[PDB]
């Protein structure tokens, strides 16, 4: 769309017994692809580990 990249997301997930889209009906997010996130994972609370 000029400088901004346009996507349409439709991913779903299954709650207890039914499915549902991740997003509600009408959301619009201004974001930057270069923005840095964190996949951080804590320490496994397991004696065996």
């Amino acid at each position: 769309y000029g400088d901004v990249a346009i996507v349409v997301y439709s991913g779903q997930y299954v709650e207890n017994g039914v499915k549902k889209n991740f997003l509600p009906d009408n959301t619009m997010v201004l974001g930057n692809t270069q923005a840095r996130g964190l996949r951080t994972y804590g320490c496994i609370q397991d004696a065996d580990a």
Binding site: V14, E15, N16, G17, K19
Partner: protein
Amino acid sequence: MYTTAQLLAANEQKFKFDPLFLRLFFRESYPFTTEKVYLSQIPGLVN
């Protein structure tokens, strides 16, 4: 008897028929040895 008939070419009247399904969705064929079949659909909905 004495008519002297000469024959020309003969039109065929071909009948149009194209599957468009067996070669578009049913590309695979399986023979039978048994008398029935079983079809399994595995519903995977993890929470």
